[PDB]
Amino acid sequence: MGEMMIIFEGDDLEALEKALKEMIRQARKFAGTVEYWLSGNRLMIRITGVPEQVRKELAKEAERLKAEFNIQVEYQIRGSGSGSGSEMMIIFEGDDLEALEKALKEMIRQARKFAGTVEYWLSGNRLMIRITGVPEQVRKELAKEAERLKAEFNIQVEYQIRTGSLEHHHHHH
Amino acid sequence: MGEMMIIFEGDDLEALEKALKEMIRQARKFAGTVEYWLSGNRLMIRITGVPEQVRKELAKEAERLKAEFNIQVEYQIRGSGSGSGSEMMIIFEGDDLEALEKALKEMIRQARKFAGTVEYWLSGNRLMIRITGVPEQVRKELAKEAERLKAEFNIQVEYQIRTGSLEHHHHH
């Protein structure tokens, strides 16, 4: 297990999407889970559930795509958390921006206080906070704080929880 | 100048990515300024620079893709037909989290001062800020502020400006 951020940049949209197609084919081949986002001339690809040697191989693939499609490539790695696979995600919603950003400040100081690392995204009236590397007891407290901020600033809250880092997709036919 | 947000949801990743391919082909076929983001089983497609009648047509296309690939579809719409928009993306990088978040606060204070709307994303050592609703003179000012913040907090900065169709990238 490990995370990897790969960034493709190029002015040719078609070549960029050809590189995407191949990169995520390689990642999925090594049992990677890919997240990606295309905006303008930039393509960002987040690959999770991949150990060290797999990341080394995917890096090789990224370097090869750089030559084949004439694009710029940069990649970054966690790189190696000692212990990991303990995740929580919180979503705040409200029409008051000022209150939302107060909630953000309190939640991430709290999360960092319990030695958790945060990622957050504010867009419109929706604020998303992702907290990783956080065990069961900590999530219980962070949930309390979420409920505290919920009541205090009169905003909406919802949660999604990952505990095993094993992801199950169900298909019905 | 109106925009549009289309969201695809489905359990079949391959079918989901087929729907994406067809949707953005249609979106690009018209006016079509396309941005998209895939995460888990949810796919978000953001379309800008599309007038009233085009957005109506793209909605029909999405409903058709729903039937063809057996996926869930929801979409939201905004507009319409204006000169501004005028979009700005700024990127801060640095090893000092406290300094990054200080730069964030100053940057969004300025943008909101000039009646601009901000969206931002912090992950690891990278901070990205999308600023909308800001005309050319304002973007030049926000660009100066970005360069000022570079020196003060000792962080890496680059900004890009999109008006069309035409997008300008500035590197430091």
Ligand SMILES: CCCC[P+](CCCC)(CCCC)CCCC
């Ligand atoms: C590496 C994927 C990042 C996707 P975004 C942030 C989501 C975080 C969970 C891009 C941030 C804009 C500033 C979602 C925007 C795409 C429509």
